[PDB]
Specification:
This is part of a larger assembly, with 1 copy of chain A (about 50 residues) and 2 copies of chain B (about 130 residues). Chain A is an all-beta fold. Chain A contains no helices and 2 strands. Chain B has a single domain, classed as MS2 Viral Coat Protein, CATH 3.30.380.10. Chain B is built from 2 helices and 8 strands, in the order ββββββββαα. Classes of the chains: A mainly beta (about 50), B alpha+beta (about 130). Chains B and C meet through loops of B and β7 of C. The structure holds one RNA strand of 95 nucleotides. Chain A: It comes from Pseudomonas phage PP7.
Chain lengths: ~50, ~130, ~130
RNA sequence: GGGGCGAAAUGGCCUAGACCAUGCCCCUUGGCAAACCCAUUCGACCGGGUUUGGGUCUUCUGACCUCGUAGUCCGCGCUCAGCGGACUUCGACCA
């Protein structure tokens, strides 16, 4: 979570202190993961011995 | 610490060691307001392949102003800043007599009236 | 500043602290020519995750030569350089008696006549 | 609605590889703490509305109360108050 305010140029209240007009936020989530892959080749054979 | 007494003619000023370090010695004058006073920076090092040496001496003094005597609110504010640095490149294997003669010549050139006029009236040195 | 007196047998040498710093202490011997003299570098630090410590002690001394006694013109010039560093890796949680015994054994091995012969005659230690 | 993923649960492809189907991960922001008002057994009764909430001097730049955040030398002494104290910085309705 985070938060950052927003202030504009000399405006509102006929002031000039760069006052804050609003705020913008961002909510999220972080995650970690791991994985493994396996590859195998096999040769097959047959026979009708008699 | 380390105290240095300087005679201006009628009064004596005292500078106190503040930042005791080998590569940077900072002396500060203690009279009243510590901010915007007299400061001195000294540095000593070597050069190249242990041939000669290098000495640096800088002296700064910034004037301050205040309006609390008449105006009803003004903190002591600095005005201008003066920088007077130096550079000494004297080799170790030299000559004591030559170094003494050079120091005497530098002292004479400093105490002469030509540099004082060059500083005050901003007239180029040439009398 | 910090003075160290070393007794050679008939004369006493004085080493003066010059570069006072925590991670590097530089002691220099003051006898005559400052360039090409006796210098000592000391360092103390930690290691890993606050386990033990590390102490380094190096001693250097470069010989100088001069020809101004006979030849017209020759500045003092350094000849060779000798480096003798050390390394102390002693853990904090140890034993005072064991440390004292180790120091006594090191002192005995230094003061013995075998290391002196190994240094002088370059004969391998084995008597 | 806007995004994410092929990971992770399996199915096509399925030395390998990269894509697919259902399929699974989030947002629908939230909180102010005080003071006052109604009709009545002509207050006891829950619910609503208004004024304030770090604050002033020229809250224009910039400073004067306060603190929070750091970096730097720091005192092992000089000053009537004393003291442990210095300088530079960013923030200040709350998660």
């Amino acid at each position: 979570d985070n938060s950052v305010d927003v202030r504009s140029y000399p405006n509102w209240e006929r002031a000039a202190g760069t006052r804050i007009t609003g705020s913008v936020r961002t909510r999220g989530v972080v995650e970690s993961r791991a994985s493994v892959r396996t590859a195998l080749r096999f040769n097959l054979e047959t026979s009708l011995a008699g | 610490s380390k105290t240095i007494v300087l005679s201006v003619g009628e009064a004596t000023r005292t500078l106190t060691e503040i930042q005791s370090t080998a590569d940077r010695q900072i002396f500060e004058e203690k009279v009243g307001p510590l901010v915007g006073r007299l400061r001195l920076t000294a540095s000593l090092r070597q050069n190249g392949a242990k041939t000669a040496y290098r000495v640096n001496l800088k002296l700064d003094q910034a004037d301050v102003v205040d309006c609390s005597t008449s105006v009803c609110g003004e903190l002591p504010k600095v005005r201008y800043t003066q920088v007077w640095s130096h550079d000494v490149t004297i080799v170790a294997n030299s000559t004591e007599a030559s170094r003494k003669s050079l120091y005497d010549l530098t002292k004479s050139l400093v105490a002469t009236s030509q540099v004082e006029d060059l500083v005050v009236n901003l007239v180029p040195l040439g009398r």
